[PDB]
Amino acid sequence: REIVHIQAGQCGNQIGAKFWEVISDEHGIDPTGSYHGDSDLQLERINVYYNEATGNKYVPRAILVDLEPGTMDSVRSGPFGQIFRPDNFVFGQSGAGNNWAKGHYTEGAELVDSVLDVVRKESESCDCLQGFQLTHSLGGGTGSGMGTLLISKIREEYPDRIMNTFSVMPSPKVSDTVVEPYNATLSVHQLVENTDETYSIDNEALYDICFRTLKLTTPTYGDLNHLVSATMSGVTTCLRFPGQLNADLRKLAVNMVPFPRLHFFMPGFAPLTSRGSQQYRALTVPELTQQMFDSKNMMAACDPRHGRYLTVAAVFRGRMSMKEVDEQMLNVQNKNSSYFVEWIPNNVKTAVCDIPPRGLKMSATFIGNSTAIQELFKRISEQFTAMFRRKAFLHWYTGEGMDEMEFTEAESNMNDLVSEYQQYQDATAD
Amino acid sequence: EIVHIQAGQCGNQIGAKFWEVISDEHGIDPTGSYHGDSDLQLERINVYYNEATGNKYVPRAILVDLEPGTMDSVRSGPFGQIFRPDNFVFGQSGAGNNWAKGHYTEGAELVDSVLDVVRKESESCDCLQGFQLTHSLGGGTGSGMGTLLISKIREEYPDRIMNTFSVMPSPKVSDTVVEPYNATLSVHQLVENTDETYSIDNEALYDICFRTLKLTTPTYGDLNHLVSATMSGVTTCLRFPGQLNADLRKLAVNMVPFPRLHFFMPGFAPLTSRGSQQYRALTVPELTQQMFDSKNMMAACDPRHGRYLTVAAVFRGRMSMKEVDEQMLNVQNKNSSYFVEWIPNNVKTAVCDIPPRGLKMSATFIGNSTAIQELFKRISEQFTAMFRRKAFLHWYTGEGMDEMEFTEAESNMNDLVSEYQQYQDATA
Amino acid sequence: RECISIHVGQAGVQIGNACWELYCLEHGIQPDGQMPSDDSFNTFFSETGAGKHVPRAVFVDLEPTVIDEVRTGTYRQLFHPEQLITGKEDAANNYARGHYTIGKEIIDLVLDRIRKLADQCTGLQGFLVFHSFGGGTGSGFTSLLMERLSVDYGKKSKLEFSIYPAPQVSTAVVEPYNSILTTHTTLEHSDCAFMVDNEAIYDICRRNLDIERPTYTNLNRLIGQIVSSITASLRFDGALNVDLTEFQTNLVPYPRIHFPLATYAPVISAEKAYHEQLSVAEITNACFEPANQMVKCDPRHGKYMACCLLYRGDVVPKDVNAAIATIKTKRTIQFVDWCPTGFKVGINYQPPTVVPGGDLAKVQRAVCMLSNTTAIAEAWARLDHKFDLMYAKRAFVHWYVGEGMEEGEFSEAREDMAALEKDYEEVGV
Amino acid sequence: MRECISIHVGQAGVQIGNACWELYCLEHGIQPDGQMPDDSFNTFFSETGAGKHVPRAVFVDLEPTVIDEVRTGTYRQLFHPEQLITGKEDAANNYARGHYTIGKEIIDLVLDRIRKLADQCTGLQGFLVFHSFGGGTGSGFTSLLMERLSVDYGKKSKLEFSIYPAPQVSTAVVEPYNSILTTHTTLEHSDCAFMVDNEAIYDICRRNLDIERPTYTNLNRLIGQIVSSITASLRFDGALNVDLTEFQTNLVPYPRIHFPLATYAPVISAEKAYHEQLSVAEITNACFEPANQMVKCDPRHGKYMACCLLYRGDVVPKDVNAAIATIKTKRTIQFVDWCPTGFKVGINYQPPTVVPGGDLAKVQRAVCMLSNTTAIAEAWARLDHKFDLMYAKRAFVHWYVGEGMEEGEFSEAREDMAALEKDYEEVGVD
Amino acid sequence: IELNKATSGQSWEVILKPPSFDGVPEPSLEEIQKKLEAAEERRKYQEAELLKHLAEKREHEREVIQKAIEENNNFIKMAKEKLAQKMESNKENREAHLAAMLERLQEKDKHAEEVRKNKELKE
Ligand SMILES: CC[C@H](C)[C@@H]([C@@H](CC(=O)N1CCC[C@H]1[C@H](OC)[C@@H](C)C(=O)N[C@@H](Cc1ccccc1)C(=O)O)OC)N(C)C(=O)[C@@H](NC(=O)[C@]1(C)CCCN1)C(C)C
Ligand SMILES: Nc1nc2c(ncn2[C@@H]2O[C@H](COP(=O)(O)OP(=O)(O)OP(=O)(O)O)[C@@H](O)[C@H]2O)c(=O)[nH]1
């Protein structure tokens, strides 16, 4: 019934801030922190991500963490900025400098205990703490390093709580930090080990969407971050907004996760939109259903048709015919039957929210456990194994403490996950 | 003097019907006061009724049930006021169509308590004849507790005679799957404990109501109307003064030739309808041959399948013993193969010059026929169906019993049929 | 000269009621005991201090009803409360119950009322025992009584008045069992036993008396008339049969054959137009036709060994011997080798008394006959086969063995009941 | 006297109970205050000094939501705050949580309200356990409580109303695990269980109440109608007949063979108008169409070991016998050799009372036919297969195992089913 | 021929053909009671033997109502004892999982130290 939020590094805070902007508006809250919405369903499950305060005011339950005032300050002098409790901002001046070892081991650890002090506070003032939510860059230092350092330390203190992450996978198409596959692979190692579920926001898909579809020639971060938040409101829809269910991170986890290592989701959303552009021609029900099982709409650059879905959860928003939905939902699975594991009876589940997102009359989210997600991990292993072969940029890590075998440790652990994903892709009933 | 216990749903409704028919014959109006015309009634009124002095009358009736329901029906019933309040002995946990509940666990809890009423009610009598138990053989209170109560009484009053009006079950009337289990278990206890037992087959009562009485929907009231007739019919000799002059033990001595062979086939003529219409009387020959014919038996057997060991017959109403005796000698001469030649004068007649209520003639029959083994094979067979596969046994084994009691109770009834046979074939 | 009339069981008890009814009528005794204006009547009446003549009779039953019907009747005053002994439950058609069960209980007390009835005697001859045969009481107790009476009154007489059973009369299915076990036990004891075949009395109350369904009363009205005709000489100052030991000699030559066949005339009704009354020649011929016989067994085919013609009233010896000469003329009438072909005739000149307001007719003349005939074996053989059928298959036996008897007692009784029938052969040669 | 307590186990269990209890208040003209403007209904309710008729029932759930809906709902005063038990932490659609982890933290309190309800019982007949088959609470908690009453109340009558999973009506991939897990653990501790296959409930509304999208209520209002017809014979002493426990004697041949099949009739929507009405002979034959069944199975193929007709309203033996007459010629009603070919018939006075603002219309003469057919083992077969499929791969299993549960409990619980499956085989042998 | 004469009676023999053959021939109280006391012995014993077979039955019922009393109690043992095992095995089990996961984490927290050590060793 209560989710504690943590944003890490640049991306972490960048995506977190937008999520908070999106969901405050979605809940009818102003930058100051005072309610104004008409429907009292906005206040229904507000207790989840928000704190009740003096003057009946609301404050997001989130810990702002980074090893540089940079983004930290951009957030404060941003739209909602004042809405956050400034005591939660745990900001060093070190700068992990897109180095996992600086975040996870050295420069991060010093701040980690200060961070926890705040988490232990936010966890305390809770009727029932559900679990934690992390938004972080898998290629940076603070996000991927200190972020996963934070997970492991939170995981010690509260093993009984759901660990959920929004892990944004790097792309050579979006960054020239050559070491990124090093920080990526090391972070995946931690994720496969200490998080209940992870939504794989891949910077490759985010770009190609913003480029090939949204047609924005030189996509800005704002252009990407917007899609991130579109899926983040979507995934968290029934966690926040009321409905038939019930509305638990754990219930979702138990239903969505058949095997414990395999918990990386392929987020998808329809309709795709250009940041801050007024919509006109609305979508039909089969458009949303078709345009949701489209590789074209997946936040992680992998082809759902290349693999097989183990579990799928599709959240449609805004008032529409459930019969039209159920009719279509069943067309899709009964036609594309090859891409659904026969050994997981009734693998597709659909939720409908009457409350839609701002500027949309109809939206639809997709969460999927398709084995196809290996295409993501594979991509990174090659990127890593290319440089590691040649011990490239490695001294940045060794001189930060870090051992050499720890790299080969994470590389082969990643290679296990790949094979593990294929094992079940192949696997049949007979 | 006589003590009358009524056990279970069946036995109580059965019992209250006897107690109302005989109270009409004795002028004991629902309240408890003699109003009858002739004092011929009053003569042998001490057999069934006591005095409140008064000069009110109380039946020598003990009421038993392991649940209130039926006790209250009697209370609410017309002739219910006449019963001694301190005589209704009932539990709350229904025994629910389980012989093992009524006979063991549940019964035991009310037995001692009931026995006290019989201890007391037996004190009031100068010299008691014995006991009368009316009950169902497929139930639990009646079927199990009644047989329990019998064994208890036999122990307490060994010299006293055990007479029962035991109603045999049937699938034509009652859907309770378990019935052949209770029946067998209870038959086994009667074979060894009662002195005379009146076999009332429900198969036959339903068949009479149906084929013969043309009643499309036979209700218990109709099936029970037939029983009250056959009760007041066989108890004409105990309640009515004449050249008989008999008792429970005299009847038993004369009817029962071998111990275990003591189950009787009640008969009645005419088979009247519950209500309509009473018009047109019967001749003597009509009344005799009807009564001897299988279509008039309360037990479902064929007298022509066996051989009668002994026969008893109480003709009521104004007639002539010449006419009557002339037909009895006619029958025995005509159907000579079905009367055991090795028991001289094996048929007894009795004529009472009092007819029952409404009808101006009656002819109640009792026959110790070897043919009754048919009624026992009928049950023993029904039992085995379930038994070979041990179906519905769990309800009984749960009560504390063992399969051995079922094996024994059947084997004992199989030995009875084996015995009833021995004599059916036997000749001088 | 005194005489104790014992009545065991319902038949004998009911029969005793009709006996003393006629006795008190014939002697003018009122149902209270007094008799206003030969003295031999006293042979049966013990006069009290209050001038009343209480009978020398002890009534016995194992259930109350019947003796309780005496303390109801007008003749309730006639007897003391001690002489009417009643139990609570009868020997329910069971000999073994009457004998070993309820018997053992009531014996001593029954013998006491006899002792104290006999503690009034200047010369008690014997006892006149009255009973049934097929009754639980009129077989079980009676036979037990004769047993102890024989020890307690050795050398004193016993005159059995037994009622042989019949199907046309209220009979029971066990009757032939009781009938044999009794006779076996009441044989070495009885000195003379008068059988009354209920079969004959039945139709005699019909063919001659016009009553189709005769009541026990009507049946007994006749029995008492024949019973009183036997006792006439004992109750009066008569010549023939002046004592109990007279029949025992005059009729019983061979001891086990102590069953004389009785005969009675004139069997006559009242609700019929009056005419000329029967003569000595009329009744004597009627005395020899089995259409008036007591026990149904062919005299015409069966050797005699005795005969006594006991007349009553308006008779004269010449006409008696004139009516005797008539029969020897055409009828040869058989007799055993060792026996004289002749009868001891007796006339008690007293008037034949009938019940006032009865079905019987007031006749000035009457007769009776005491005749020991081998034909009386035809009566036993009837009862012997009835016993024979049931005992083979052991039908009803369990009731008897349940009352303390032994299974052997049936064979023992049937061996003796067969022995007796060989004695009817050994005699009727 | 003849008292009986009803125990409701989360969501399905609670919601169903409310439909039951509201209908009961209507049946015995009771007002939602406990007050009311025959005494046989006191076997379910209990009168206090003020003349308040509180039900002999317990509402239990591991989380608050559903029981809170009752605590504020249209009948808030009809119960005790003590007799309405709740947790906070849900069973997360996991049996292992429902049974162990979360369950243990309430059981003791729960059993106490049962004991306090048990005290006011002059002569307790037994218990009625309304639970889900696939719910974390409905499965885990129920079995724990059922095991605990077989201890506390020893060999006392434990009756059940199980809610068989249907994909059409919600579900969650794991449900068949929770289904088979509870089926197993409850078996020894049950007396007689009434299954309700949610698809057959769905199918009926769709077909007769003409509801294209059946709401939970729509189903429950219907379910409560069938359940009430079963318990009619307890809260009503109608001379006519009405006699449960007597039915149970024919219904339960052997102890493991305790699943009667309900075939309710007539389900008619308030729209028909001049349809008035069905004859006894019509509704009798209605019970023989597999379209009216509570659990989807085929007893035309299946053998029989009991048939019990529970009539209610305008019923006269004449035509019931005439009805039973015709059916007895229809050569599809084939019984076993060891079993008689009879029908235990019970009739009630009080006809079915209908809910204000309902879907169904006031029927003059209703029935429900309980029967012991081997065709029920199809429900087991249906469930066992889906189980096998996921178990084969040990899919989701880790969530159970993670809450304590040994890997063997699943196999044990499956062989037990396989045995019961084979037991219905064996029994059907002639 | 003549026999006797009296007040209210008279008698005389009346011969016809005399006998062809001049010749003719061709109880204790103790042993009554001895038979009666043997008879009662019988009656009293078989009725006393009956009372033994009835007392035999009274014991079966005494054992049967007892089997049922134990049958439920032995069952409550099994039910209570199983539940006790299950909650324990589970308490044991769930706790070994939780303990081993924090041990893995603590070991992974150990590595961190020897790394900041390998950084200072390099420095
Ligand atoms: C074959 C015997 C049946 C079980 C009867 C009967 C029950 C009965 O007599 N009952 C059960 C309540 C009372 C009674 C009757 O119907 C109200 C009344 C008139 C009566 O006779 N009352 C009794 C009172 C009474 C008797 C016994 C016990 C308790 C009360 C009386 O008049 O004295 O129904 C009429 N029957 C024909 C039936 O049609 C019943 N059907 C069945 O059981 C069938 C079809 C027939 C046997 C195999 N299966 C059922 C549909 C009611
Ligand atoms: N003629 C005649 N025979 C009688 C009379 N009463 C009974 N009997 C016969 O006696 C026989 C039965 O013997 P009972 O003496 O009556 O029976 P019981 O068992 O000895 O005596 P209770 O049981 O006390 O009546 C049958 O043969 C009857 O026909 C009677 O008054 N007159």
Ligand SMILES: Nc1nc2c(ncn2[C@@H]2O[C@H](COP(=O)(O)OP(=O)(O)OP(=O)(O)O)[C@@H](O)[C@H]2O)c(=O)[nH]1
């Ligand atoms: N017929 C019917 N089925 C229901 C109802 N509520 C839930 N279900 C079914 O119950 C199953 C899911 O189990 P639940 O009872 O919801 O779960 P629970 O663990 O008992 O309760 P929670 O604590 O809320 O999770 C699915 O098969 C649903 O379709 C209802 O009111 N009616």
Ligand SMILES: COc1cc2c(c(OC)c1OC)-c1ccc(OC)c(=O)cc1[C@@H](NC(C)=O)CC2
């Ligand atoms: C208490 O009621 C009765 C009691 C008895 C009898 C009887 O039938 C007429 C009764 O009426 C039913 C009786 C029965 C059967 C006999 O033989 C089969 C017999 O010989 C003799 C009898 C009875 N004796 C007579 C002479 O009828 C005595 C016992």
Ligand SMILES: Nc1nc2c(ncn2[C@@H]2O[C@H](COP(=O)(O)OP(=O)(O)O)[C@@H](O)[C@H]2O)c(=O)[nH]1
């Ligand atoms: N989508 C998205 N990616 C970002 C954003 N900021 C940085 N990144 C990505 O994050 C990776 C580097 O991590 P970064 O957030 O700069 O480092 P940190 O400050 O140490 O967490 C690269 O792959 C960048 O593309 C952002 O706001 N949005």
Ligand SMILES: Nc1nc2c(ncn2[C@@H]2O[C@H](COP(=O)(O)OP(=O)(O)O)[C@@H](O)[C@H]2O)c(=O)[nH]1
């Ligand atoms: N003829 C008749 N049979 C009845 C009556 N009541 C029930 N039965 C039969 O009784 C049996 C069931 O036993 P019952 O006396 O009702 O139950 P109990 O209370 O356990 O003795 C079945 O064979 C029924 O057919 C009745 O009054 N008359």
Ligand SMILES: [Mg+2]
């Ligand atoms: Mg007698």
Ligand SMILES: [Mg+2]
């Ligand atoms: Mg749950």
